[PDB]
Amino acid sequence: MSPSDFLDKLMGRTSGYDARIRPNFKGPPVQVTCNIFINSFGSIAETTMDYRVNIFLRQKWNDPRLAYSEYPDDSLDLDPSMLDSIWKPDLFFANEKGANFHEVTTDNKLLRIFKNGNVLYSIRLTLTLSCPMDLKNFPMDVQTCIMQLESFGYTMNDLIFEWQDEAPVQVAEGLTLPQFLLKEEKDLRYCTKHYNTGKFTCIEVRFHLERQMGYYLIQMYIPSLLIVILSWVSFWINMDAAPARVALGITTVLTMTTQSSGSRASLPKVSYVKAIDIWMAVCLLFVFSALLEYAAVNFVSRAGTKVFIDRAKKIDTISRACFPLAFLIFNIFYWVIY
Amino acid sequence: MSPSDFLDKLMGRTSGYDARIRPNFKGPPVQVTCNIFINSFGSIAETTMDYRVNIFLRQKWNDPRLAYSEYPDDSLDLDPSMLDSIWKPDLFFANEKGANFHEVTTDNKLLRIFKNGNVLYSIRLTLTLSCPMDLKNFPMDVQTCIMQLESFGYTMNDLIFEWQDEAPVQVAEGLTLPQFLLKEEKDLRYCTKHYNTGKFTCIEVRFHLERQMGYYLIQMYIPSLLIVILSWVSFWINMDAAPARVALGITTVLTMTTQSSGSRASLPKVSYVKAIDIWMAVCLLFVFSALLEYAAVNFVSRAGTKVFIDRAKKIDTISRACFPLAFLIFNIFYWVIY
Amino acid sequence: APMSPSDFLDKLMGRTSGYDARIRPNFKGPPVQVTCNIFINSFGSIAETTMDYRVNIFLRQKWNDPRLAYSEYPDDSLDLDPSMLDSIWKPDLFFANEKGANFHEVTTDNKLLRIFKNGNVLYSIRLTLTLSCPMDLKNFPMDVQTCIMQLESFGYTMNDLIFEWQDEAPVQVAEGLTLPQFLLKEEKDLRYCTKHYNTGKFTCIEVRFHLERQMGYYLIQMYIPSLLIVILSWVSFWINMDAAPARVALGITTVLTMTTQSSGSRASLPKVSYVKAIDIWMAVCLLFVFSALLEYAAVNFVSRAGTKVFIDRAKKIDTISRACFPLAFLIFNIFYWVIYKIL
Amino acid sequence: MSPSDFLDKLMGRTSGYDARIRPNFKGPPVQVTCNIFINSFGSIAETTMDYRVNIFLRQKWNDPRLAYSEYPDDSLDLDPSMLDSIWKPDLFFANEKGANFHEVTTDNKLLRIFKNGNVLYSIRLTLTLSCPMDLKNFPMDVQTCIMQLESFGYTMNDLIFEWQDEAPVQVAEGLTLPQFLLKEEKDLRYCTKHYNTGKFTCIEVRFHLERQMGYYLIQMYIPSLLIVILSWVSFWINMDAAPARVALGITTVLTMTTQSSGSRASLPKVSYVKAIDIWMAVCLLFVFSALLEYAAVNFVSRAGTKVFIDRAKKIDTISRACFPLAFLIFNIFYWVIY
Amino acid sequence: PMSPSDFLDKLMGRTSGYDARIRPNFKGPPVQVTCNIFINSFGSIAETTMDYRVNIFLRQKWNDPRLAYSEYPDDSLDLDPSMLDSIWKPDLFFANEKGANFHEVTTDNKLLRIFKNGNVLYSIRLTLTLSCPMDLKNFPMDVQTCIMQLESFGYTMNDLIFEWQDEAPVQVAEGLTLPQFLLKEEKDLRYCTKHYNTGKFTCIEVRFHLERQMGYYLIQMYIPSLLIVILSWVSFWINMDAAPARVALGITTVLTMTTQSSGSRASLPKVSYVKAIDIWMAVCLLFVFSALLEYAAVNFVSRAGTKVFIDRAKKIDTISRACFPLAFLIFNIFYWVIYKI
Numbered sequence A, B, D: 001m002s003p004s005d006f007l008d009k010l011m012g013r014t015s016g017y018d019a020r021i022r023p024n025f026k027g028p029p030v031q032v033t034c035n036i037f038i039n040s041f042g043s044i045a046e047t048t049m050d051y052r053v054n055i056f057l058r059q060k061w062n063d064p065r066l067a068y069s070e071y072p073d074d075s076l077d078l079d080p081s082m083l084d085s086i087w088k089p090d091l092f093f094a095n096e097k098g099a100n101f102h103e104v105t106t107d108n109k110l111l112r113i114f115k116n117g118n119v120l121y122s123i124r125l126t127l128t129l130s131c132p133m134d135l136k137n138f139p140m141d142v143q144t145c146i147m148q149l150e151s152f153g154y155t156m157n158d159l160i161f162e163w164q165d166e167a168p169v170q171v172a173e174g175l176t177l178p179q180f181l182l183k184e185e186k187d188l189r190y191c192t193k194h195y196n197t198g199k200f201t202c203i204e205v206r207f208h209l210e211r212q213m214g215y216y217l218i219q220m221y222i223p224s225l226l227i228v229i230l231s232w233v234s235f236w237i238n239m240d241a242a243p244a245r246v247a248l249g250i251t252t253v254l255t256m257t258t259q260s261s262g263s264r265a266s267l268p269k270v271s272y273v274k275a276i277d278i279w280m281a282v283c284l285l286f287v288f289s290a291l292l293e294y295a296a297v298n299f300v301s302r303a304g305t306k307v308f309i310d311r312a313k314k315i316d317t318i319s320r321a322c323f324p325l326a327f328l329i330f331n332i333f334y335w336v337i338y
Numbered sequence C: 001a002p003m004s005p006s007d008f009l010d011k012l013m014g015r016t017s018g019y020d021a022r023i024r025p026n027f028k029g030p031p032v033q034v035t036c037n038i039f040i041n042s043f044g045s046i047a048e049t050t051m052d053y054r055v056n057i058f059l060r061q062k063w064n065d066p067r068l069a070y071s072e073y074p075d076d077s078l079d080l081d082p083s084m085l086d087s088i089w090k091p092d093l094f095f096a097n098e099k100g101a102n103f104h105e106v107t108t109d110n111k112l113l114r115i116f117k118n119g120n121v122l123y124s125i126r127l128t129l130t131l132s133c134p135m136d137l138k139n140f141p142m143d144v145q146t147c148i149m150q151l152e153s154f155g156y157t158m159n160d161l162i163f164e165w166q167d168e169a170p171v172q173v174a175e176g177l178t179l180p181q182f183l184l185k186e187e188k189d190l191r192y193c194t195k196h197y198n199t200g201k202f203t204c205i206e207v208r209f210h211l212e213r214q215m216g217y218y219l220i221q222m223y224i225p226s227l228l229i230v231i232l233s234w235v236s237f238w239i240n241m242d243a244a245p246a247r248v249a250l251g252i253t254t255v256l257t258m259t260t261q262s263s264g265s266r267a268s269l270p271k272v273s274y275v276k277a278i279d280i281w282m283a284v285c286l287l288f289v290f291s292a293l294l295e296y297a298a299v300n301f302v303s304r305a306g307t308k309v310f311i312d313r314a315k316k317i318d319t320i321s322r323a324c325f326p327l328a329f330l331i332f333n334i335f336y337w338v339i340y341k342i343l
Numbered sequence E: 001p002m003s004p005s006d007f008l009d010k011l012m013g014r015t016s017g018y019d020a021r022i023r024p025n026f027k028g029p030p031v032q033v034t035c036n037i038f039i040n041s042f043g044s045i046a047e048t049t050m051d052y053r054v055n056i057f058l059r060q061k062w063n064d065p066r067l068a069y070s071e072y073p074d075d076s077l078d079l080d081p082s083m084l085d086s087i088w089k090p091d092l093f094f095a096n097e098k099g100a101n102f103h104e105v106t107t108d109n110k111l112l113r114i115f116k117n118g119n120v121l122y123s124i125r126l127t128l129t130l131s132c133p134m135d136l137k138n139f140p141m142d143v144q145t146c147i148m149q150l151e152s153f154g155y156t157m158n159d160l161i162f163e164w165q166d167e168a169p170v171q172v173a174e175g176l177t178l179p180q181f182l183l184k185e186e187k188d189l190r191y192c193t194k195h196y197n198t199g200k201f202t203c204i205e206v207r208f209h210l211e212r213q214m215g216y217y218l219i220q221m222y223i224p225s226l227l228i229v230i231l232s233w234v235s236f237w238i239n240m241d242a243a244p245a246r247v248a249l250g251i252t253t254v255l256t257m258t259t260q261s262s263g264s265r266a267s268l269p270k271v272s273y274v275k276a277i278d279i280w281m282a283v284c285l286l287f288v289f290s291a292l293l294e295y296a297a298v299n300f301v302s303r304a305g306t307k308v309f310i311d312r313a314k315k316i317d318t319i320s321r322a323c324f325p326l327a328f329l330i331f332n333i334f335y336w337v338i339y340k341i
């Protein structure tokens, strides 16, 4: 039989096939089996609180109307134009902010049918998915971003999604993220939805994203360490040089504040204390205490008498040991806790 | 009866149904009943003065042409392709800046008809809606953002919208906003429009958004408290150290101004006094007064005589008590008022 | 019984009608007189940098098509399904100064079709337009702009099609519509922009909106903080002439604050090559702040030798400065504000 | 003859016209004559290295199939829907980054045919065109931005573009650019392309854009003149006041560097020396030399003896004359050269 | 001769019986497609988003015996692109494409040409944004390798095979330049043959090599950092008694050096490895910070105003005037030799 006539008899004019009717429409729900290949993964934004993926979405279900005997071939690879002629699930991504198909240079779609009427339908999609983030431990945080595959119009009695048994989520070889590490273990689960329009099938996959710490050592933690260490050189400067020691004190405090708000600029305006806030707060405390230290040194030595000059000198010599020692103790606590 | 023939007889070729004609077109207006499920709520922008939602819009109306007896089923879940074949309301969002449908992986639409000809039509939409904001109490403000559902072509004598009686506005479980708290109570009302083209049905829903205060304590109010407290250390510095005390005075004023304009950068250019303006103004007054305080101290002590040196010293000792005390009193007033 | 709607639409503009939408009303006769009016649903995004603004409007067009006249119903008008707009002739109005334009299609096409007994048509369509508005920033931020909107025919010359603003209420504005930076003046000017191209002479009607910039924002974020830096600069005059590092510190940091203030405000504007009002203010403020530093340089220099005659001469420069600097700055403010907030 | 029948006989059902076949397809190439009206011209970006225009593109060619005698009218203005029914050139813009048609409120198109079969086809287009820029003389530069009209599928033996003889490029009355002056003289030329697919017609127009200098006097050259003049006040300050004279020297150098990199922020990251780089370099040299001048003054006067104090004083008095004099000479050279 | 309208009708139209849902030789071996690209433009090379943009003409060549003709003596026929919808064509897609679009102004930017023997030439104009993962370890003396993968979506290796053309598979428009990079003449061609759970799919790849131009960074990064280091040294010629002056210099050079450093990091992605620019900024900041510590030492050892201690402090300064520049010069030798040799 010629292919043109076969397609005509199976799903075309002479077929009497109606794509508005599901497989076994008087019978049990259509069991769809999903799996995704993750071609790319990125644009993980804290501010907009979302991420982007390019995937191949594979769906599998049985349509006894598409079973064939005319060829001995176990499967037939069909032209994607025939997808419009057949019934297919109405899967949508429940937490999708933006989604699109790919049409260059032709529709990036795949249709394959088997002897027994099974269908394989793969379609390429770019999705932007919402991923609410918990920034309490930033930048030592780990996020959990999800992806929900749901039916819009079919209730649980007509259509049921299920992750494939073997390898439901594949990831492209050598795929990396610059800011995160994508953990090998993906959690699969059900998000079965109950709306006032009914009960709807929904399956979910959770990716775990561990933020890479290296960037923050170099661009956040070390340069704050500078400003704190810089603040301490005041303690080796002559107590008579007020303009010099105040200059150091101010400029370290101010550098430390612009450092602090510089890092807050890349994040959303959450109303809870993050780990980076604690660090910047304590660093700023140490830098501010050092200025108060000189204010004390300057003030106790007003009268130029030896007894008072000696008392001021003791404040400096204690400071040279205690400030670094205390800051070292703080680092032990901070790093151990997280 | 086969589904294909039933759809053909009800709204297809052999039906004689005309979707250009409303239900009961010679009779009273079509009573439509709306309800929304809010799948997401965010992108609340002060600068552009708008917000974004992803909703399922449900509409319900009766079309006696679609009543059926051929099946005992109380309702039939139909393929959304049939939405093109039936009449439906021309609801539009009157305050929408941008709107779009969702088409991945198929049109995110739902059609359900009942024995008596009732229709349920749910469609998924991303909307950007305008929300004019009153920033007088920012950042302790609370906004009221609306959403108007209106008919474009049908006047009140052909078509009438109405919110559902039970649960017209549902919100997705666990939906949060990072900057605001969305209040449980939504106001419903009428926006019935009168244009030169006629009188048009319009129903409205108001969401109340209370801005979360926590972010502003950490990134606005506390760091301004620093600069004010920092300004006071000048009062414990030796009056002879002019370059040190002027250095403190300048750099606190300038830090305070860049702090002030830093916060104004995230807002629209409104021409009224906001709460944040008052705070920054008073903080800047306290920081500026402290510099003037030294200018006074320096100036009254020009001649190096004890009577004048004593007078200058009194200005400092009074300042150490009064500046903080006055600033504390201001905080009591400011916080109590808002 | 009366005629069914389906058959009436079929006989009027459908299969059996013989209507051709490629042919205008009275095509051998005089031009089609179209009557336009707009409802302004929103008005905003007034950008100086990109030099444009945005509106959401309902565009109403009215014209007579004797082919669409009917007697089959006693109704004075019939409200028709917008799908029928494709079946009828309609003007090819476009916005001549539009940078971006779009229709609205959620949840259906935001369109309106209404025909009357005598064949008159009312066609309303909802549009978001971004329109170009060349701006004269010479008096910024006390400026007032005039932004236009041109409705023009693309393909029909003046002998086939003519646009005209409605007589009664051609431009309506939504109740309670405000702009945050501007005041939209009640009076809109209507005019003709009749175009002559090498392809012919084309109808074009125009509406001008007047936008008065609100001054309040600039008092708080531009004029008052510059007043600070000038007043701050004066405290140097009460500081001891012996404290050079203190008085130079004040002088530098006020000049530098004043320059970053000045270029901070220029960041929100296009790169025009003419002097604006804000430039004059920042220039004079910077002059007063710079003169104060030069004042100390003079004080410091004349008092080099520590002798009373020279120390006294330097002290006189300071005491004169305490009066003259503020007095001169006050006089400047009188002149500046009188000039711009009069002419 | 009724218009409906005339269009039917000329290019419709009964016409036998095939728009897949060019005019005189066995004969010589179709001679197309182009002209543009420039409705707007702007968005001239240095960073992205492109510009934007809104044009009416007019094309003229003869199609003997569309010649008519049925009406005495010299030309017929046709409904643009008929453009789909006729053959037309496949002109594209070879250096276009983005292009779009205008469809509000109807397609912004014009079709006019003449007795002899001539066609006038005008279409409105927004184009973003690439314009590689030579920034060597910025901001006294003058750019040359082009616009190439090319055939995609027709080789030189089937289709030939040519600029109109009389007034090929019109510009809207009163059209201005804020940063540039668009010169009256446009160059027209040929870009005839040779690809491995063949030889393709291409005509080009070059616009000359002279950058307006006024903005840069006020926001770049004058404020740099300030910092240089400010640097000189150090020379009238007492040599004993080191913290004051070093303060001036540092802050002028640093102001001068942030000024310099502030202006580089608006440009692409080209790897050649621009005119603005030379100016900022020399200004920074004069400001840096002034600091070195004090370092010298301070250093030669270490021992507080008259002979060395006098030698230091001479360095200052020479500096007061030579620094401005040298800077004036530099300005003469710099401005004369460009 | 036969009219064009009838010829197109008999070849691929109503009366032809041609089915574009069926590939050439569908029971036979795979369709051999031969690709070549003309690069009309190349740019928008972004480090942050980690991608680049091209405007290309994509040419595909394959044989369709159904489209062979004898009715005309012409070796090839240039056909109207509307006929592309009527014929079978490969389903080539760009595997590493983030965004892609066709060009439709003023008509579809497409080309169809068929030959006597049924060969087809199909050229289509495309703007592509392609992902190019970057290794910034040597930034800004880095060289990137950006790829472009042409793949079949639906046809497995037994039905469809892509292959680069033998002669001149990748042409580049005359005078095409990039402002930040140099595009190297040699393009590598290779296979990316994909194995998915849906099957084995043809894929061919081209690699462009992009050498970052160094000139910009000398002027806007390396020289201005050289300033701050040289500026830091003037402290050594300032009087040791002038603490506020020498501390002022020390602070402001350190702080200028830190804002310089983080200014340059703003244009890059947030990678968690050490780049070459990080080492430079680190060492510059070390030299500027050491100079401040140098004065702290000078100030501290000279506390008691006695000659023996004043002399010791003075020696720290005189050694510093020679050693600081000398050491910084030695560092430059090492740094430049390592990265540029």
Ligand SMILES: CC[C@H](C)[C@H]1O[C@]2(CC[C@@H]1C)C[C@@H]1C[C@@H](C/C=C(\C)[C@@H](O[C@H]3C[C@H](OC)[C@@H](O[C@H]4C[C@H](OC)[C@@H](O)[C@H](C)O4)[C@H](C)O3)[C@@H](C)/C=C/C=C3\CO[C@@H]4[C@H](O)C(C)=C[C@@H](C(=O)O1)[C@]34O)O2
Pocket (backbone or CB within 6 Å): A257, A258, A260, A261, A264, A271, A272, A273, A277, A278, A280, A281, A282, A284, A285, A288, B214, B217, B218, B219, B220, B222, B223, B225, B226, B229
């Ligand atoms: C009194 C403050 C003075 C000025 C002190 O400031 C300094 C040092 C000098 C002064 C002694 C510096 C200051 C931090 C403070 C110490 C503060 C902390 C260690 C933390 O905060 C405290 C107070 C806070 O309650 C306001 C409290 O939150 C609770 C109660 C709240 O209910 C009222 C509730 O909503 C909330 C969710 O849970 C918290 C647990 O604990 C720490 C979280 C503060 C960090 C602050 C900052 C980090 O970057 C910010 C900014 O980028 C900048 C420029 C400077 C920083 C600063 O200014 O930091 C900054 O604002 O020390």
Ligand SMILES: CC[C@H](C)[C@H]1O[C@]2(CC[C@@H]1C)C[C@@H]1C[C@@H](C/C=C(\C)[C@@H](O[C@H]3C[C@H](OC)[C@@H](O[C@H]4C[C@H](OC)[C@@H](O)[C@H](C)O4)[C@H](C)O3)[C@@H](C)/C=C/C=C3\CO[C@@H]4[C@H](O)C(C)=C[C@@H](C(=O)O1)[C@]34O)O2
Pocket (backbone or CB within 6 Å): B257, B258, B260, B261, B264, B271, B272, B273, B277, B278, B280, B281, B282, B284, B285, B288, C216, C219, C220, C221, C222, C224, C225, C227, C228, C231
């Ligand atoms: C008076 C200025 C001098 C320089 C004084 O400045 C300082 C310190 C002491 C100086 C002598 C600092 C200054 C505040 C002033 C005190 C001012 C206020 C408490 C408020 O304002 C006053 C006057 C103002 O109108 C003159 C008036 O508006 C009304 C009437 C108008 O009709 C004429 C009407 O249309 C308008 C809408 O409502 C107002 C109610 O009341 C307060 C609102 C001012 C805030 C100012 C600022 C907040 O951030 C701004 C900016 O980010 C910055 C960099 C510095 C700030 C500053 O510069 O703050 C800043 O610009 O004191």
Ligand SMILES: CC[C@H](C)[C@H]1O[C@]2(CC[C@@H]1C)C[C@@H]1C[C@@H](C/C=C(\C)[C@@H](O[C@H]3C[C@H](OC)[C@@H](O[C@H]4C[C@H](OC)[C@@H](O)[C@H](C)O4)[C@H](C)O3)[C@@H](C)/C=C/C=C3\CO[C@@H]4[C@H](O)C(C)=C[C@@H](C(=O)O1)[C@]34O)O2
Pocket (backbone or CB within 6 Å): C259, C260, C262, C263, C266, C273, C274, C275, C279, C280, C282, C283, C284, C286, C287, C290, D214, D215, D217, D218, D219, D220, D222, D223, D225, D226, D229
């Ligand atoms: C020589 C200037 C010295 C350094 C003086 O500078 C200062 C103080 C110190 C010196 C005494 C500071 C300086 C202004 C000057 C005084 C100058 C003016 C009041 C005006 O300008 C003069 C000369 C000018 O000719 C270039 C001339 O315009 C030409 C070209 C015009 O085409 C556009 C043309 O339309 C016109 C007819 O003709 C003009 C008419 O009149 C005033 C326009 C200058 C404003 C300058 C500034 C405002 O913000 C700018 C910037 O954001 C910044 C950081 C600092 C400002 C500054 O630096 O301001 C700034 O650059 O005083």
Ligand SMILES: C[C@H]1[C@H]2C(=O)N(C)c3ccncc3[C@H]2CN1S(=O)(=O)c1ccc2c(c1)OCO2
Pocket (backbone or CB within 6 Å): A020, A021, A022, A023, A025, A153, A154, A155, A158, B002, B003, B004, B006, B007, B071, B073, B076, B077, B078, B079, B080, B111
């Ligand atoms: C057969 C379809 C649908 C329908 O159109 N008709 C006429 C009948 C008739 C009798 N019983 C049920 C129906 C419904 C249900 N089925 S369906 O299960 O194949 C179906 C089809 C399409 C659907 C859908 C369900 O959910 C929303 O989209």
Ligand SMILES: C[C@H]1[C@H]2C(=O)N(C)c3ccncc3[C@H]2CN1S(=O)(=O)c1ccc2c(c1)OCO2
Pocket (backbone or CB within 6 Å): B020, B021, B022, B023, B025, B153, B154, B155, B158, C004, C005, C006, C008, C009, C073, C075, C078, C079, C080, C081, C082
């Ligand atoms: C039946 C329609 C419409 C119409 O086409 N005809 C012929 C008639 C005939 C007699 N009376 C009224 C009409 C109009 C109104 N009705 S309708 O109520 O179904 C209708 C249909 C579509 C509409 C509309 C109203 O306003 C918005 O767009």
Ligand SMILES: C[C@H]1[C@H]2C(=O)N(C)c3ccncc3[C@H]2CN1S(=O)(=O)c1ccc2c(c1)OCO2
Pocket (backbone or CB within 6 Å): C022, C023, C024, C025, C027, C155, C156, C157, C160, D002, D003, D004, D006, D007, D071, D073, D076, D077, D078, D079, D080
């Ligand atoms: C009737 C149309 C158009 C046409 O097709 N023909 C055949 C004739 C015949 C005789 N005279 C004029 C025409 C032209 C013009 N008329 S029209 O006035 O209805 C018309 C129709 C559409 C138009 C247009 C003019 O200019 C803009 O686009």
Ligand SMILES: C[C@H]1[C@H]2C(=O)N(C)c3ccncc3[C@H]2CN1S(=O)(=O)c1ccc2c(c1)OCO2
Pocket (backbone or CB within 6 Å): D020, D021, D022, D023, D025, D153, D154, D155, D158, E004, E005, E007, E008, E072, E074, E077, E078, E079, E080, E081
């Ligand atoms: C007549 C057309 C085109 C065609 O479709 N056929 C069938 C034939 C037949 C015989 N000889 C030539 C052709 C070609 C050439 N002509 S055409 O010159 O009008 C033409 C038409 C469309 C074209 C084109 C050339 O190149 C770009 O796209």
Ligand SMILES: C[C@H]1[C@H]2C(=O)N(C)c3ccncc3[C@H]2CN1S(=O)(=O)c1ccc2c(c1)OCO2
Pocket (backbone or CB within 6 Å): A002, A003, A004, A006, A007, A071, A073, A076, A077, A078, A079, A080, E021, E022, E023, E024, E026, E027, E154, E155, E156, E159
């Ligand atoms: C002829 C097509 C396709 C088909 O529709 N039928 C009916 C048959 C019949 C017998 N054997 C194979 C088929 C398949 C395969 N062929 S095809 O090789 O031309 C083809 C056609 C389209 C394809 C494809 C392969 O890969 C995916 O897209």
Ligand SMILES: [Zn+2]
Pocket (backbone or CB within 6 Å): A185, A186, A187, A208
């Ligand atoms: Zn897990």
Ligand SMILES: [Zn+2]
Pocket (backbone or CB within 6 Å): B185, B187, B208
């Ligand atoms: Zn309420």
Ligand SMILES: [Zn+2]
Pocket (backbone or CB within 6 Å): C187, C189
């Ligand atoms: Zn007026």
Ligand SMILES: [Zn+2]
Pocket (backbone or CB within 6 Å): D185, D186, D187, D208
């Ligand atoms: Zn020229």
Ligand SMILES: [Zn+2]
Pocket (backbone or CB within 6 Å): E186, E188
């Ligand atoms: Zn190689």
